[PDB]
Design an enzyme around this catalytic site. Structure first.
Site, mmCIF file in Angstrom:
data_model
loop_
_atom_site.group_PDB
_atom_site.id
_atom_site.type_symbol
_atom_site.label_atom_id
_atom_site.label_comp_id
_atom_site.label_asym_id
_atom_site.label_seq_id
_atom_site.Cartn_x
_atom_site.Cartn_y
_atom_site.Cartn_z
ATOM 1 N N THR A 1 -82.688 -57.344 21.673
ATOM 2 C CA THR A 1 -82.510 -55.936 21.337
ATOM 3 C C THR A 1 -82.733 -55.039 22.550
ATOM 4 O OG1 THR A 1 -83.411 -54.074 20.061
ATOM 5 C CG2 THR A 1 -84.890 -55.914 20.531
ATOM 6 N N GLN A 2 -82.276 -53.791 22.449
ATOM 7 C CA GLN A 2 -82.478 -52.814 23.512
ATOM 8 C C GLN A 2 -83.936 -52.373 23.604
ATOM 9 O OE1 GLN A 2 -79.673 -49.595 23.012
ATOM 10 N NE2 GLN A 2 -78.003 -50.975 22.420
#
Lengths: 210, 223, 212, 190, 205, 143, 188, 205, 224, 191
Positions: free
Chosen positions: I1-2
């Site tokens: 994920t970011q």
């Protein structure tokens, strides 16, 4: 950063005759795509047969008109109720505008009256103060729709000198009706002030917005 | 300031044949949170003036303090303050507009929209609007915020122009104002159900109504 | 194939170098009415004083759009072609739900890069339907809907005078009044009013310049 | 970097700079490609892409001439060059490139000169110049449609003298080529 | 979220009780401060007794719900009625595999013979948590303590209805993105029941 | 179980990444004359400054079909995706019309697009080199 | 050699049309014809040339297959579709003028850069400024004019636009009737 | 809020009951994710029976409180015991006149023989509001509904103590910046009373 | 994920003469809100191995799924996969570290910190740590997050060198870890009172304790 | 704006280029980039328009006031120190402006020439030779400088430097005004 300026639209037009002057404006105050008021005059009788109108930011125009009227009152107090000429008023307005050079008024100003000889006189002022005398001037977001109409239906070289007040009123009304048809901002009314040796006369016409 | 923190939504006002009617809801919202209930946003000045302020609550209280100071100074030293030497709505509006424009020019504006309503001594209705930029204008119907986009057409359907003012009774204007407030409560997220109303009439004087609720709610068209 | 991406970099290079409406839908007891204004403006200038903003997807399914005009027209035409082909294939009257699904999936495919916000009204054998469609692919169902720059005045008028059981004439009058309020109180709306009424079991009635 | 072209009533004169690349000093033409025995191309602009484009165009034109056993007209050559240049930047950031095409149509026996900018705008001109920021003053005041080759050479010499009046020693000189009915020649004295 | 995209500022509450599950929500869709729709049906039916409520992007959640309903129809064509765990797993897989491009959060309320009604929550990011009850949305933050203080296991039907009504009334009161009517779906062994409550009812509680 | 196409970028690049346009003189370099791309298009320019929607559009239907095949595998078994892929491959391999690029009717029937129109169908899509029947024959038969 | 930008004006007279474009004097015209349909394109010169070539291609194929010349409405739809094809890489302002060979009614229309059609019953102005020229055209326009009157009106509008901002300014005017097309030059 | 300062993220409550007022708070001061001071007395006293709790910037609130105590000492020397309204007015003026330079919010509780205990709140901006009870802080948002469902006028001392304890316990439970012990000051006619409640007592509620 | 959305606090572990002890609290916080109170961050993998994961909850569940798949596949098609085919902690840690590094090279990392503890087949203690960047290291005591700044100084005073491992008993190590958890609960806003403990020993084999609360808290001095 | 100064055994030679303005065509015969501080002290300046001339005139007025008040002439060292102090004071509370000053004098008490250079920050350095403007010529000065050179040799070196500067300049380099400061005072060379 707070933004101190704004815009309220509106269109004004000043014409100089041979023994009279005409200053007209549309009486609609609008914010962005909304109508604040369908009748809000923008042309005022600023003392000794002088009509003044500042178009653009409404608050700046009101402040400038108020300051000029107070200056005229003190001028009458100082010099034996001497009548203020149109050129002296133009220079006063130039100084008032340039006094805010670094925080300028966001308005374009037009004044009209009679000169010393008795001919009609119209002066135009940019927001910072530069002014000049013109036969006809249109300001606001309809000038490109009004000036060609006048140039087509009259000549400034039927010469403008031979026109009467009624013909000028008719031309102004026709040009503003055409602008109202073509431009969304213009409409809802048109107020015209005519300056002659007898004084200032006011007329009103209803445009196509009710 | 830079932005409002606790804010009011809308004030709506109309002219009728004998006077003016103004209304505003009682709520102070903290962002998306409906925080304070019971905030009076209509200020009765004199016996004939009502000022409706929408926007930053702290600036509204500052303007209330200014109005109280003005009223107190008017009686100094007039022995006829309750008499013909009272404060006209034009005086109050001129003072408020001057203050707003001066503060705008000082880069420290009051984030408010103000509607001044009342009846002059000669009986002429007074209704003006000013904002944080000092822009002032008049109209037979006035509104702020979402009222300027939703309640304004509803009010203009009644008082369309200046000639329609003598034809509008107080009952019609009050009904239109109540309906406009109901519409605002329907379609405004920051609005409130409770609101206050003020009627200024050249014969009956000032009538202030509080704790008015939106009624006749239509929600049955769901399932 | 499909929409092209050629000269995208060239367009960005040129840009970096300085090289450069009121719609309402009202659902009444036996159908749906969709009304719109008839003014087209290229900014301040009024380009056309009588423009038809009511577009047709199917003989009994109409829509009106806002946002990017070219995108709205292209998407409406494509969905109309798909609906006509589906009806020919199935030999059945098209349903508003099918048009809604096609529009939703097409708009979600482009991830909001096709700007078209629509009000879609229609009548099919299952009944009368009215939907609002957003450019990102989200759709909503309602009894009365408004769209455009004058949608706030129209919504105020609709909220003022809406009931569950409305006749055809009352619905037409309500839509006309909403469009009139939008015309008067909004600068972007003007001119005449276009109406389209769709009942159950009857042909769609399209009235241009209903109120001039 | 300046490329010049003058179309006299019966010839095309193309002039170009000798050589300059980065801050490296070289002794040493690499800006003119012979597209056809009667059609010449002079290119200026960014280093690395312009040469590749010119070589691609020359290869295509030579292939066409071999296939058809015929010489393509200068107008068709210019149109093909414009189309190829427009296609090359249809999917990438545009690069600075200016092309002057000078030919002698044998069917009409007429000289022709065309200029194409970096976006692919082909314009037929009596005279053209690129790389100079002017020089059009001399090219406009002392130009005639019926100028002979000697007069065109004199005008080009005046332009070169003007160039060699506000430039440093880096200005090596000007290489001049002439396209006419006898073919393509290179001018050494002027 | 993307610029100009509709966001689901809702108030969602799923509660498990002795005879099944109840899923309730408000009916307001906003555009920042303007109410786009006063009445909305936020209760999405994925299967006959498997419902859900959505938060985050409206388009992404609608697409995910459509795909999950299609998947459950395919599953039913083979093995009959699915379970709430299967639907939650499909939702979680779709949300987690697409979290880099889609913003979505789900609350799933289901009933089946084996499990007798269950609640699952899938917040932003794509993680699934099984809880006795779940609350979500902008207004849910204002009723955390109230729900924590007034929750019991194996409550009756009327007790759960009252609990959800009171909690959602408070959430609507303190939040500007929560609307008028309260919609509740009761999933039990008898069937599916739909209840609606109006502001004049719960504002007087 | 993807919805938006993913992993559309390239992990590595090379000068001979396209085997169909390899130069005969130097097999490790591309042939710019037969590419017919304008002659000034290095491969590096294809790695930067791209529209963020081109990859999503060019891989949308493939991603949807892959998700459908994954759902079939999860629910029905391996036989159903195997049969679907087998039918699609058989239809694609037995069609060779060098003079047209329009898809066959059977392909559209299998893809359930008999009565569906998209902008790909409306807009399907001079050169001195590589636009004849022989080039397509060589590409088809691996010659 | 800068030739980007220009002004094109289209007007409808009693049973005719008039389409006029600005020039630069000191060989590049912005009006093209594909039979009895005329198209004027303003904007980037390369895009103008590309559109001209593409529309010549498509009109030639249309004539070969349909065995008849294309009508102005069909050409308008074709131009709109071609413009919308490059949705994310759009090119300009096109103006279409003509007279239907069967009905005889005049037709003028304008397009944006992604093919949104604006069909005007009075006149169409395309250009960069489009403010002074638009006002002059609005003031000078009268419906149902004779071909001579229409030519005089459009020529006066162009001359007035030229006067208010040169040495090398020219104009090309086409007066199109059902059976005759007249091409004239204006040298100011 | 200037960068690098200390924020007073807390749980502040003030409740008016039959015999006076009670002001309660937590004892946690955090700098990001680290608890800088887990034993903090946030019940600032500005007069013998006038107390306050601060939020926003610690430095600005401390300066304002010192100036207010100076002002009240001058007033007491001149006229005697001030009312809570006067202290609230001084607080409001100080917060409003410096709102462009200082970020401060105050909750003022007081008692006097005439008004018999009052609560005022000055949020960020400088407005003043008089309420039967007030809550403030980052952790208050989780107890709003609870505080709206369990407050009664003219409660006894024990009922108010229990109400404040429960509400602050919930706020501590659901807020990351709220924790530690609960401190309460009871202002009545008899005098000032101090109460402290430890986590092992309110966490079992 | 970011970026992570729901996160854990910290995991702390140490070695004693007969094995290892690991501990982690039970809390999932949604920003500044303590949302979930039933998250388990210690996963017993195999017979005598424990994995503690701190960070994004979704990625933690993904890693748990990977570990379950590894356990199932190791015993797949192997009826005797219980004595000689039992998974050793080194293999599990190597797999996890390789996965983390490969995903980091893909520019799509897993936002987690992983600690693997256990006892090898020959009785040797195993304790290693890996992060989202794929960097791995080993030490007699390990911790993540705020525990790397407060719990580590407390644990190193018991086991400071490799020669200190035989001198450290199970009771001393358990008391030190409990004290470290209490200190973390004192000075961490995101921490939770509840925690879980796991003791891996070469004689008993395993002992997993849940629902452990921090006790003996001193708050009386706040009265002053 | 290029200024040069060469110190020889008996005098100081200061050379300044013709001042030009962007987009303005001017034809004049004057030295507006040089002020005579005292009969035996000359100053040349180069920098931003407006500020530099104001600073130079301020310095000249102060030095003339001192000369009138004391009936005496300041030494070049004292003049340079005063200029440095005033220049440092000018940018005390404002954004610094580009300015470079060469001061050349003939100390009568020491009977020797002196030359100083001050940059925009107020760094005063005594130099045997100095230049400012184009940034080429220091190598030419270094290879052809001697502390005991005469006036004629310095003038020849200055001519060589001027020719070298003109060659690189795109023929827009006009003439150079040359002044000599020695025991007889300040004079201008028309050669």
């Amino acid at each position: 950063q707070f933004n101190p300026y704004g815009d309220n639209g509106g269109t004004i037009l000043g014409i100089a005759g041979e023994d009279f002057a005409v200053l007209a404006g549309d009486t609609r105050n609008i914010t962005d795509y909304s109508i604040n008021s369908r009748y809000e005059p923008k042309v005022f009788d600023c003392g000794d047969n002088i009509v003044m109108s500042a178009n653009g930011f409404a608050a700046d125009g009101d402040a400038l008109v108020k300051r000029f009227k107070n200056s005229v009152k003190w001028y009458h107090f100082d010099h034996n109720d001497k009548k203020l000429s149109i050129n002296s008023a133009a220079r006063n307005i130039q100084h008032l505008l340039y006094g805010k050079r670094f925080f300028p008024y966001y308005v374009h100003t037009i004044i009209a009256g009679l000169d010393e000889d008795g001919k009609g006189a119209v002066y135009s002022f940019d927001p910072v103060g530069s002014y000049e005398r013109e036969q006809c001037r249109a300001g606001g977001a309809a000038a490109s729709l009004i000036m060609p109409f006048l140039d087509n239906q009259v000549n400034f070289k039927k010469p403008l000198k031979y026109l009467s007040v009624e013909e000028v009123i008719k031309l102004v009304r026709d040009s503003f009706t055409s602008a109202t048809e073509r431009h969304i901002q213009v409409g809802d009314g048109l107020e015209i002030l005519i300056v002659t040796k007898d004084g200032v006369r006011k007329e009103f016409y209803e445009l196509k917005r009710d | 300031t830079q932005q409002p923190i606790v804010t009011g939504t809308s004030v709506i006002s109309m002219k009728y044949d004998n006077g003016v009617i103004i209304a505003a809801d009682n709520l102070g919202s903290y962002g998306s949170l409906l925080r304070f209930n019971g905030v009076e946003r209509l200020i009765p000045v004199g016996d004939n003036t009502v000022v409706g302020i929408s926007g930053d609550i702290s600036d509204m209280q500052h303007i209330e303090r200014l109005l109280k100071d003005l009223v107190t100074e008017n009686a100094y030293d007039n022995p006829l303050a309750d008499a013909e030497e009272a404060l006209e709505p034009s005086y109050i509006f001129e003072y408020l507009a001057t203050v707003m424009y001066q503060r705008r020019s000082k880069m420290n504006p009051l984030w408010n929209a103000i509607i001044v309503a009342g009846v002059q001594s000669n009986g002429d209705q007074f209704l003006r609007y000013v904002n944080l930029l000092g822009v002032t204008y008049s109209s037979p119907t006035l509104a702020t915020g979402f009222g300027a986009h939703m309640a304004n057409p509803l009010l203009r359907k009644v008082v369309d122009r200046e000639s329609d003012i003598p034809k509008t009774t107080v009952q019609v204007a009050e009904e239109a104002i109540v309906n406009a407030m109901r519409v605002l409560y329907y379609r405004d997220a920051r609005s409130s159900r409770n609101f206050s109303l003020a009627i200024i009439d050249k014969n009956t004087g000032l009538t202030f109504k509080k704790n008015l609720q939106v009624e006749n709610m239509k929600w049955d068209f769901a399932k | 194939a499909g929409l092209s991406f050629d000269n995208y970099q060239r367009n960005n290079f040129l840009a970096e170098n300085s090289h450069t409406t009121t719609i309402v839908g009202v659902k009444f007891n036996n159908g749906v009415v969709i009304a719109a204004d008839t003014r087209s403006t290229q900014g301040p200038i009024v380009a056309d004083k009588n423009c038809a903003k009511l577009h047709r997807i199917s003989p009994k399914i109409w829509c009106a759009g806002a946002g990017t005009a070219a995108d709205t027209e292209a998407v409406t035409q494509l969905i109309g072609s798909n609906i006509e082909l589906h009806s020919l294939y199935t030999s059945r009257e098209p349903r508003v739900v099918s048009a809604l699904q096609m529009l939703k999936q097409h708009l979600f495919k482009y991830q909001g890069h096709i700007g078209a916000y629509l009000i879609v009204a229609g009548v099919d054998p299952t009944g009368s339907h009215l939907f609002s469609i957003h450019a990102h692919g989200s759709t909503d169902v309602g009894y009365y809907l408004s769209l455009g720059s004058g949608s706030l005045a129209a919504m105020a008028v609709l909220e003022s005078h809406w009931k569950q059981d409305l006749t055809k004439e009352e619905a037409i009058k309500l839509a006309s009044d909403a469009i009139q309020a939008g015309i008067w109180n909004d600068l972007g709306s003007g001119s005449n009013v276009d109406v389209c009424v769709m009942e159950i079991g009857k042909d769609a009635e399209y009235l241009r310049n209903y109120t001039p | 970097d300046i490329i010049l072209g003058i179309r006299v009533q019966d010839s095309v004169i193309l002039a170009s700079s000798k050589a300059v690349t980065r801050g490296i000093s070289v002794l040493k033409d690499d800006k003119t490609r012979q597209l056809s025995p009667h059609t010449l191309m002079s290119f200026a602009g960014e280093a690395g892409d312009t040469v590749q484009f010119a070589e691609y165009i020359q290869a295509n034109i030579q292939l066409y001439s071999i296939r058809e056993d015929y010489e393509l007209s200068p107008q068709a050559v210019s149109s093909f060059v414009r189309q190829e240049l427009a296609k090359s930047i249809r999917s990438r950031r545009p690069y600075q490139v200016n092309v002057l095409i000078g030919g002698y149509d044998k069917k009409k026996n007429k000289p022709e000169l065309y200029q194409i900018d970096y976006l692919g705008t082909k314009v037929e001109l009596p005279y053209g110049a690129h790389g100079y920021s002017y020089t059009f003053f001399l090219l406009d005041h002392h130009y005639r449609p019926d100028m002979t080759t000697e007069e065109g050479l004199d005008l080009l010499k005046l332009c070169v003298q003007e160039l060699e009046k506000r430039m440093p020693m880096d200005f090596k000189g000007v290489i001049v080529k002439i396209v006419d009915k006898d073919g393509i020649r290179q001018v050494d004295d002027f | 979220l993307k610029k100009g995209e509709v966001s689901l500022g809702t108030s969602i509450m799923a509660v498990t009780f002795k005879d099944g599950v109840i899923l309730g929500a408000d009916s307001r869709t906003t555009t920042g401060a303007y109410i786009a729709n006063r009445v909305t049906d936020k209760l999405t039916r994925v299967h006959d007794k498997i419902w859900c409520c959505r938060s985050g992007s409206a388009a992404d959640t609608q697409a995910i719900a459509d795909i999950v309903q299609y998947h459950l129809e395919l599953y039913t064509s083979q093995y009959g009625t699915p379970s709430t765990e299967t639907a939650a797993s499909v939702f979680k897989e779709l949300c987690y595999e697409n979290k880099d491009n889609l913003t979505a959060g789900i609350i799933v309320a289901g009933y089946d013979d084996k499990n007798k009604g269950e609640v699952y929550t899938i917040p932003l990011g794509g993680s699934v948590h099984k809880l006795p009850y779940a609350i979500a949305g902008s207004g849910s933050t204002f009723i955390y303590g109230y729900c924590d203080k007034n929750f019991r296991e194996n409550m009756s039907k009327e007790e759960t209805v009252d609990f959800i009504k009171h909690s959602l009334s408070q959430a609507i009161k303190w939040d500007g993105s929560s609307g008028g009517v309260i919609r509740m779906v009761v999933l039990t062994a008898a069937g599916v029941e739909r209840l609606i409550f109006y502001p004049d009812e719960y504002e007087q509680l | 179980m993807n919805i938006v196409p993913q992993d559309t970028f390239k992990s590595q690049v090379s000068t001979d990444q396209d085997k169909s346009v390899l130069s005969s003189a130097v097999p490790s370099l591309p042939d710019t004359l037969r590419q017919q791309e304008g002659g000034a298009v290095p491969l590096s320019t294809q790695l930067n400054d791209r529209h963020p929607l081109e990859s999503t559009l060019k891989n949308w239907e493939t991603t949807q079909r892959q998700r459908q095949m994954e759902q079939y595998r999860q629910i029905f078994g391996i036989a159903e995706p195997m049969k679907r892929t087998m039918e699609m491959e058989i239809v694609n391999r037995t069609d060779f019309n060098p003079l047209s690029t329009n898809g066959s009717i059977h392909r559209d029937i299998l893809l359930n697009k008999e009565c569906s129109i998209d902008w790909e169908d409306v807009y399907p899509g001079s050169t001195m080199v590589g636009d004849d029947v022989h080039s397509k024959i060589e590409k088809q038969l691996g010659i | 050699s800068s030739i980007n930008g220009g002004i094109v004006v289209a007007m409808t007279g009693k049973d005719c049309v008039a389409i006029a474009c600005d020039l630069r004097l000191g060989k590049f015209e912005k009006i093209f014809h594909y039979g009895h349909v005329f198209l004027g394109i303003t904007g980037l010169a390369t895009d103008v040339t590309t559109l001209n070539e593409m529309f010549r291609y498509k009109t030639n194929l249309y004539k070969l297959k349909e065995e008849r010349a294309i009508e102005p409405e069909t050409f308008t739809q074709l131009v709109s579709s071609s413009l919308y094809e490059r949705r994310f890489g759009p090119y300009v302002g096109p103006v279409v003028a003509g007279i239907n060979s069967k009905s005889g009614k005049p037709f003028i229309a304008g397009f944006d850069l992604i093919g949104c059609i604006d069909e005007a019953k009075d006149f169409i102005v395309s250009g960069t400024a489009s403010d002074q020229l638009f006002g002059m055209c609005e003031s000078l326009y009268e419906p149902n004019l004779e071909p001579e009157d229409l030519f005089e009106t459009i020529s006066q509008a162009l001359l007035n636009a030229a006067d208010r901002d040169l040495s090398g300014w020219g104009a090309v005017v086409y007066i199109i009737k059902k059976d005759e097309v007249v091409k004239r030059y204006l040298k100011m």
